[PDB]
Each structure stands twice: as structure tokens, then as C-alpha cells.
């Protein structure tokens, strides 16, 4: 007569190839009969049974999503930590041949043709069978967009993409995009920001996070890009002709407003500044947890603690036997600001498994306890 | 036409895959043509240099498990990819047959040897009935069954049902027939990386009468009242940090009589993978016959060793007349020759993992 508990919990995220087999397991121990139910995106896949496995013999892209199990017995029920199954795939290039025009000196922006893939494929740009590497005048953005900084007469022509998926090794080629250059002498062009920094969120402890800013000017040689954090100039982590700002091992202290300032050296031209926010996140970690086993007298009031910390601050949710606790309607159940649950006028029907889930955009945490009402 | 090679992405440090599934490793590098790739399994050559950036395994086997890494090269030089550990989930059959053991005292029955990755979850059975951990029944992390105070009805055949949590395999072994404070299962040395959610020390003690037996947990001589579970046999630290490292002791005593306590301890090491403090610039230029200093420092627990490679080849510090490695980990090349031009790679390695930084060395004139 021992309440359920998980011997192991599944990983938060999983990447699998299409056509491969997937085996989900609900590894719990406890008194018989220990039965299991499976959920996909908070929707029931199966009924309660002695089958602790959920198996997909041939994985498809549509099978991607969140899976979790519920284990139960005569004592109560527990919700498994949910796992994200991601299916590696790559479709074909959707768009056909396209046409685009740019003025002489101004920047040509050619977006990579839309193709469905997970993860986003690595892109190599080609013109007439020749690779186009990043250079002083040619930039390739994180969105795999091709940017010609100072367009000239010979820049006109057909550009196409070779995209490769790094998980399944799929390699596909897109349709050509014809770029034309209009009004071909040469006069000074003011510095402008083509690809401004976008809002970027990343979890603490990742290997790298990158901000990006592509600027244009004529002459391009006079163009200089300055990176700032909260108004202060940054001198480290800058690469790719001052268009990339890379932070290795980002911390919550590295969060803030990052600005890209494009200027012309040896000139009186005023700079152009465009910025975005970097958010560094930390998953929930518990500060206060309930005891493994909680015993309490009938008709009395019990305080069950649950506090957690994270960036952003984690929301705290309670479950009673794998079912959501309604603190709104029930007079007996009250939720304290720290996240603790208070049950007043304890009835024998409150006996069972209580679970606390602390959730934030960076992840989820779970702690459980058995409430026995004497 | 003159771009040194570089990696657009790096592979995950560890990946678990099922037997019979297909695995596709990719060497995602960019650079000037011809960009060729070579594959290595446990630092042994799998392929020759070719335009195939993929290594594909149609049907994964247990023998395919190990460390894989690629080398990318072109006219500019070569780079070593960060190695990835491919682990193949499987479970064989129970090898050993029926065994017999006798005890007068505690009965210690090891779980039957079965080949499996990962280690399977084990449920012990007696005569078709599950035997959960109790005041007198302990189950260790190595899945060894320990009956503390054996009695007449304790005798009989015990067997294990083992389940692999990755492929869902479930197998049953052959029966094993079984017919003063001491420490049976002492705390073992445990190393773990920070952020593993949990790490557990274990100590199983035996005494008659068992009710008077008491286990106290200590860290560096100081008693702990938290993280203790399973009848004081388990000490669990949630979200271990480098501060949690140190000597943990299990002390078993009797709350009566003059019998001396028994103490057994082990070391807990919390490790952090290498992270670079100082890195070389993307491109380093230097004059012929002169000396160049290329910096490389990194931190980790334990302190990471630092090794240099030149174009995916180990730098011979044995013949260190021109090449010297400073104690800080920096590389110095004296009497610079035009043949020193190319990709230099600095690998910072620790037991918790490895990190890599690269640079292009151009020797003028
Ligand atoms: C990019 O996001 C910002 C908001 O950033 C938030 O606030 C920061 C202080 C930091 O904590 C970030 O992690 C947050 O996500 C948008 O800027 C404005 O934000 C304020 C609140 O801070 C909001 O009231 C305004 O409405 C936001 N501006 C607009 C136009 O709605 C900014 O707009 C975002 N960028 C884009 C392109 O949408
Ligand atoms: C467990 O390991 C210790 C040594 O641990 C190492 O040193 C610690 C200071 C710490 O840095 C750990 O991370 C290291 O792994 C073993 O201690 C040895 O004990 C024997 C006798 O028992 C003695 O002869 C040796 O000199 C000791 N070695 C050291 C380095 O002190 C201990 O034996 C290990 N436990 C078991 C059960 O083998
Ligand atoms: C992706 O596949 C394409 C072909 O589908 C490869 O491109 C070929 O490369 C050879 C080698 O010189 C050329 O002879 C062919 O003409 C190319 N085909 C096309 C359609 O251009 C390409 O190499 C593959 N990707 C990688 C990274 O190797």
C-alpha cells in the first residue's frame, strides 16, 4: 500500500528521424495494480492499462509534440513530466522563380525561399554554380537571407539556394531568383541599417547566442558598425565584419538592450541606430517543497508549501491525483502568493497525491506529496 | 576562393538512439572548394577524405556505440569537429542461470548479469509477489537485493524483472535460491555534472536487533538532516553544485550497549565542463622566422587540460624546438616558417566534456 512514484523522468526534448521507431516509457513503481495512461498535447491517447509503453513504429512529422503519462493505483495518481518529441524532417522548396530589383549602390535583399524543415537547414548561396561566401560586401543572415551591400552592374543575375538539414542529411536546391540593378557613376550613399537586431530569447547555459546587424553605405570601406549594450560600447564577441555579436555562455546579466549603430568614418554623416532586447532565461528550481508524506487530522486546516525561482518568475500550478485543482471555485482550497496550497476543513476525500508544477518559458519542474487524512 | 573552413553548427555532446533505427551524422562546415570530409570513430579512421559530409547508419547496432567526429578540409587547412558520443539503447538476455546461496544475519543477493544500456530498472519478486523496500529489505543503486534480518520464512527463490526505459524491453531472470552493526553497502565514490537534477549517496547497514540500528549522514564531519530517505539508506542532493562536493560519511550505531559505531565514507565530485576565458582572434598574422604567441585559457572542475592541433593533426610538443606550450595553456611558435600557415585549433578538455576554439594563422612573406 505505497503511493506511486517515478523511478525516472524523461528528458525535456527529443529529436528523432522520420520513419524511426519511438518508445515512450512510464517508469513508475508502487503497489499493484499500477496502471498507466498516455497523453499527447494534453489530450488522451489511451485509457488506463498495464501497458507502461507508448510506441510509434514509424515516426512522422505529425507525431511531433508533447507527450506525458499518468500513473495510478488505489492510493492515487501522478502526472509525468512532459517530454517534447521533435521529428527531424525536410520538405521541398515551395516557391518558384522570382524577380527582384535594386538601385545602384543601394542594398539588394534576397530572402531564402520558404521551405518546411526541422530543424532550420543550413543554407549555401549560389550564383551560376558558384558558391557565394560571406565577404566585405556580401552578408548572409541568421534567417539565411542574402544581402548584397553595394550593388554594382555585374551583380545582376540569378541566385539560388542549396539547403541542408543537419539532422537527417537532407539536401535540396531551390528555384532561381533574378536580381536586376537599375540606374547603373558613383556618389556617396548615407549609412542605413538593412537587417536590424531582432528580439532574441535564450536559456542560460547554452553554448552561444548571437545578435546580428547588417549595414550599408557608399563607400562601404568607410562604413563602421558599433555594438552597444545599454548605451555602452561592446568590444568583444564581434565578428563577420562587425555584423555579428556573439555571446558565449550567456547569463541573466547579459540580458538587456543591444543596439547596432552604423556610421561613416572620416565623415560628418550622423549615425543610424537600431536595437533589440536580449532575454536570458533560467528554468524553475524549487526553493521550498512539501514533505514526501504529509499526515493531517480531519476537519483541520493544512498548509502545503511550494515556492520556486526562475527567470521569468515561474507560475505555480497544483494537481490533485493528476487533475487540476480549482482554487477559484472551492472555498476550502486557497492558493498563497508564494504558491503554497491551503486546504481548510479537511475531508477524507482529500486523501491522495498532490502535485506541484512550476512552469516558465525556460522549462518545467515537478514535486509530489501524499496527503493522508486521519 | 580564399576562405578558411569553419563550422556553421556543432553536434550535441551526447545522443541516445535505439537499435535498428537510422543515424545521420552531419559535418556542417563552410569554406572554399574543394571542401572534403573524413569521419572518425573513437579516433580511428572510418572514411577517406571525400565530398560526402554525411555519415549514415541505416541500422544502428550496439557495436556502433562510441565517439564520432569529423575532419573538414580544403586548400586553406583542416578542422577537427567536436566529438559526439553516440550511445545505442539495447537489452540482451539474462546470461546466468539458477544459483544457490545460503545465510545463517543479512542475505545479499546480486541481480543477475544482463547486457543492457542503459542499466534497467529492476523489480524484485518472491514467489510471484513483488517485494518492495522495507524496514528489513533494501534495494541498492546497483540493483542488489539486501535482506537485513533473515528469518525462516525469508528463505526461498528470488528473481528479477528488469525493464529498459529506452526501448521498453522487459525480461525475467532465472530464480536465485537463498537458504552487531555492520556496513554491507558502503557509500561509493560519485562524480556528477551540475544540473543533473539529482545525485545520490547510499549506505546500507545491518544489525540485530535491527530496530536499534541508526544511520547518521555526515558531510566533512558535519551532520546532515536533509536529503535523507529510504530508512536512512539514501542521501539525495537535488541540483548538485560544486559547493556540494566533498567527503560524505555513513555512520551506523546502536542506541544501546557499548558497541562502537561503524563509519564508511566516499567522495562526491561535482564537475563543470570547460569554458573558455581567453580565446585567440579569428585570424592571427605573424612574420617569418619570428615568434608568435597564441593565447588559450579555460576554466572547469577539475581544471581542464589544454591541447593544440594544427589542421586536425596533433601538434608535436615532443619536438618543441619551435613549438612551446605555456603553463597557462598558450601556444608559442618560434622561427615561423611558411608551412605553419593554416588552421590552429585549441581544445580544452575535462571529464565533464570538451570545448574548441579555432584560428587561422597566416605567415607573411
Ligand atoms: C521587443 O520586445 C520589447 C519588449 O521587451 C520586453 O521588455 C524588456 C525590458 C525585456 O525585459 C524583454 O525581455 C521584454 O520582452 C518591445 O518593446 C516594448 O516593450 C514595452 C514593455 O517593456 C511594451 O509596453 C511596448 O509595447 C513594446 N513595444 C511595442 C512597439 O509594442 C519591442 O516592441 C519588441 N520588438 C518588436 C519588433 O516587437
Ligand atoms: C574514492 O576515491 C578516493 C580518492 O578520491 C580522490 O581524491 C579526492 C581528494 C577527490 O579529489 C576525489 O574526487 C578523487 O577521486 C580513494 O581514496 C584512496 O583510499 C585508499 C585507501 O582506501 C588510499 O590508499 C589512497 O591513497 C586514497 N587516494 C587518495 C587520492 O586519497 C578511495 O579509496 C575511493 N573509494 C573506494 C571505495 O575505492
Ligand atoms: C547537394 O546535392 C547537390 C546535387 O543534388 C550537390 O551538387 C552537385 O555537386 C557536384 C559536385 O561538383 C556537381 O557536379 C553537380 O553539378 C552538383 N549538382 C547541382 C544540381 O548543382 C551538392 O554537392 C550537395 N551538397 C553538398 C554539401 O555536397
SS (H, E, C) B294-306: ECCEEEEECCCEE
**Correct CATH for B274-365 of 2.60.40.10, 3.50.50.60, 1.10.10.60, 3.40.50.300:** 2.60.40.10
| Residues B187, B189: Cα–Cα separation, whole Å | 7
Contacts of B95 by beta carbon, 8 Å cutoff, 6+ apart: B112, B113, B114, B115
Helices marked H in A71-220: none
Architecture of the domain spanning A90-182: Sandwich (2.60)
Phi/psi for A253 (5° steps) reads -70, -20
Distances (CA, A) of B52 to A8, A99, B85: 39, 33, 21
What residue ranges in B103-206 does DSSP mark as E strands?
Answer: 107-109, 114-117, 121-126, 129-130, 137-139, 145-147, 156-163, 170-172, 176-178, 182-185, 190-193, 198-202, 204-206
Pocket test for ligand 3, best of A92, A124, A162 (most atoms within 8 A of CB): A162
Chain B residues within 8 A (CB-CB) of chain A?
Answer: 3, 8-10, 18, 20-22, 24, 26, 28, 30-33, 53-54, 56, 121, 123, 130, 132, 163, 165-168, 195, 197, 229, 238-239, 275-276, 282
Ligand 2 pocket member B302 (CB < 6 A): no
Are B232 and B217 spatial neighbours (Cβ–Cβ below 8 Å)? yes
Summarize chain B as % helix, strand, coil (round to 5). 5, 55, 45
**Correct CATH for A189-282 of 2.60.40.10, 3.50.30.30, 1.10.340.30, 3.30.450.20:** 2.60.40.10
What is the number of other CB atoms lying within 10 angstroms of the CB of residue A219?
Answer: 15
Burial class (CB in 10 A: 0-12, 13-18, 19+), A13: exposed
Which ligand does the CA of A198 lie closest to? Answer: 1
Considering only CA atoms, give the Rg of chain B: 28
Contacts of A254 by beta carbon, 8 Å cutoff, 6+ apart: A247, A278, A280
| Residues B13, B64: Cα–Cα separation, whole Å | 16
Nearest ligand 3 atom, CA B52: 28
B219 membership: H or E segment, kind and range: strand B213-219
| Residues A135, A151: Cα–Cα separation, whole Å | 13
| Residues A283, A313: Cα–Cα separation, whole Å | 9
C-alpha cell at B337: 616558417
CA dihedral for A253, A257, A258, A263, sign (positive or negative): negative
Grouping H, G, I as helix, E, B as strand and the rest as coil, residue A75 is coil
Find the distance separating the first CA and the last CA of chain A, reported in whole Å: 16
Ligand 3 pocket member B51 (CB < 6 A): yes
Ligand 3 pocket member A171 (CB < 6 A): yes
CA dihedral for A56, A62, A64, A67, sign (positive or negative): negative
| Residues B125, B161: Cα–Cα separation, whole Å | 7
Strands B342-350 and B353-363, bridge-based pairing: antiparallel
A21/B21 Cβ within 8 A: yes
| Residues B112, B177: Cα–Cα separation, whole Å | 12
Q: Ligand 3 centre and the CA of B210: distance in Å?
A: 74
Contacts of A139 by beta carbon, 8 Å cutoff, 6+ apart: A146, A147, A149, A195, A214, A240, A241, A243
C-alpha cell at A166: 543537419
| Residues B246, B235: Cα–Cα separation, whole Å | 14
A55/B26 Cβ within 8 A: no
CA angle (A355 as vertex; A52, B123 as ends), nearest 5: 35
Q: CATH 2.60.40.10 occupies which residues in chain B?
A: 274-365
Q: Ligand 1 centre and the CA of A157: distance in Å?
A: 39
CA dihedral (B250, B255, B258, B261) in degrees, to 10, reads: 0
Ligand 3 pocket member B67 (CB < 6 A): no
C-alpha cell at A194: 538593412
Q: Ligand 1 centre and the CA of A361: distance in Å?
A: 16
Q: Ligand 2 centre and the CA of A270: distance in Å?
A: 66
Q: Which residues line ligand 1 (CB under 6 A)?
A: A 199, 277, 279
Of A27, A167, A286, the CB nearest to B165: A27
Ligand 3 pocket member A126 (CB < 6 A): no
Q: Which of B63, B120, B65, B64 is nearest to B93 (CA)?
A: B120
Are B215 and B206 spatial neighbours (Cβ–Cβ below 8 Å)? no
- State yes or no: cis peptide before B118, omega within 30 of 0: yes
Cβ-Cβ contacts under 8 Å, A23 against chain B = 18, 166-168
Q: Which of A24, A95, A33 is nearest to A59 (CA)?
A: A24
Cβ-Cβ contacts under 8 Å, B163 against chain A = 25, 27, 52
Burial class (CB in 10 A: 0-12, 13-18, 19+), A191: buried
| Residues B350, B304: Cα–Cα separation, whole Å | 5
B282/A31 Cβ within 8 A: no
Distances (CA, A) of B78 to A124, A192, B175, B311, B323: 20, 37, 57, 4, 19
Cβ-Cβ contacts under 8 Å, A287 against chain B = none
Residues in chain A: 374
Strands A177-182 and A98-103, bridge-based pairing: parallel
Are A296 and A346 spatial neighbours (Cβ–Cβ below 8 Å)? yes
Residue for cell digits 540485530? B208
CA angle (B41 as vertex; B37, B44 as ends), nearest 5: 85
| Residues B19, B25: Cα–Cα separation, whole Å | 16
CA dihedral (A317, A322, A323, A325) in degrees, to 10, reads: -40
Of B3, B53, B168, the CB nearest to A53: B168
Nearest residue (CA) to ligand 3, atom 23 = B51
| Residues B307, A347: Cα–Cα separation, whole Å | 66
Assign residue A279 a region (left: φ > 0; alpha: ψ between -120 and 50; beta: otherwise): beta
| Residues B229, B210: Cα–Cα separation, whole Å | 17
Q: Ligand 3 centre and the CA of B57: distance in Å?
A: 21
HSE-up of residue A155 (Cα within 13 Å, Cβ side)? 27
Are A296 and A374 spatial neighbours (Cβ–Cβ below 8 Å)? yes
| Residues A5, A11: Cα–Cα separation, whole Å | 17
Q: Please, which contacts does B122-126 make with residues 24 or more away whose CB atoms are closer than 8 Å?
A: B122/B160, B122/B161, B122/B162, B123/A29, B123/B160, B123/B161, B123/B162, B123/B163, B124/B158, B124/B159, B124/B160, B125/B158, B125/B159, B125/B160, B125/B161, B126/B156, B126/B157, B126/B158
Nearest residue (CA) to ligand 2, atom 1 = B189
Are A258 and A227 spatial neighbours (Cβ–Cβ below 8 Å)? yes
B275/A124 Cβ within 8 A: no
Burial class (CB in 10 A: 0-12, 13-18, 19+), B225: exposed
Q: Which of A100, A98, A118 is nearest to A174 (CA)?
A: A98
Strands A352-360 and A315-320, bridge-based pairing: antiparallel
B282/A23 Cβ within 8 A: no
Amino acid at each position: 500500500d505505497v503511493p506511486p512514484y517515478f523511478k525516472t523522468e524523461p528528458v525535456r526534448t527529443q529529436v528523432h528521424l522520420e520513419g524511426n521507431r519511438l518508445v515512450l516509457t512510464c517508469m513508475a513503481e508502487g503497489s499493484w495494480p499500477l496502471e498507466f495512461k498516455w497523453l499527447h498535447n494534453n489530450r488522451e491517447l489511451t485509457r488506463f492499462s498495464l501497458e507502461y509503453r507508448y510506441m510509434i513504429t514509424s515516426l512522422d512529422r505529425t507525431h511531433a509534440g508533447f507527450y506525458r503519462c499518468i500513473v495510478r493505483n488505489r492510493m492515487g495518481a501522478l502526472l509525468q513530466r512532459q517530454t517534447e518529441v521533435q521529428v527531424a524532417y525536410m520538405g521541398s522548396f515551395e516557391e518558384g522563380e522570382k524577380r527582384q530589383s535594386v538601385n545602384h549602390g543601394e542594398a539588394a535583399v534576397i530572402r531564402a525561399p520558404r521551405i518546411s524543415s526541422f530543424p532550420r537547414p543550413q543554407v549555401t548561396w549560389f550564383r551560376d554554380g558558384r558558391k557565394i561566401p560571406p565577404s566585405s560586401r556580401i552578408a548572409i543572415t541568421l534567417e539565411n537571407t542574402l544581402v548584397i551591400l553595394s550593388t554594382v552592374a555585374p551583380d545582376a543575375g540569378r541566385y539560388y539556394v542549396q539547403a541542408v538539414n543537419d539532422k537527417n542529411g537532407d539536401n535540396k536546391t531551390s528555384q532561381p531568383i533574378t536580381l536586376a540593378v537599375e540606374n547603373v557613376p558613383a556618389d556617396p550613399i548615407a549609412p542605413t541599417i538593412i537587417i536590424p537586431p531582432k528580439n532574441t530569447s535564450v536559456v542560460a547555459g547554452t553554448s552561444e547566442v548571437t545578435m546580428e546587424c547588417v549595414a550599408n553605405a557608399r563607400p562601404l570601406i568607410k562604413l563602421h558598425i558599433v555594438w552597444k549594450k545599454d548605451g555602452a560600447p561592446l568590444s568583444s564577441g564581434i565578428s563577420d565584419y562587425n555584423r555579428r555579436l556573439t555571446i558565449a555562455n550567456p547569463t541573466v546579466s547579459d540580458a538587456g538592450y543591444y543596439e547596432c549603430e552604423a556610421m561613416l568614418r572620416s565623415s560628418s554623416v550622423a549615425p543610424v541606430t537600431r536595437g533589440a532586447y536580449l532575454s536570458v532565461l533560467e528554468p524553475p528550481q524549487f526553493v521550498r517543497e512539501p514533505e514526501r508524506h504529509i499526515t493531517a487530522e480531519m476537519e483541520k486546516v493544512v498548509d502545503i508549501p511550494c515556492r520556486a525561482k526562475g527567470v521569468p518568475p515561474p507560475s505555480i500550478t497544483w494537481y490533485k491525483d493528476a487533475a487540476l485543482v480549482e482554487v477559484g471555485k472551492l472555498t476550502r482550497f486557497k492558493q498563497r502568493s508564494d504558491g503554497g496550497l491551503q486546504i481548510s476543513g479537511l475531508l477524507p476525500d482529500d486523501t491522495g497525491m498532490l502535485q506541484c508544477f512550476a512552469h516558465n518559458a525556460a522549462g518545467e519542474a515537478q514535486t509530489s506529496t501524499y496527503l493522508a487524512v486521519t
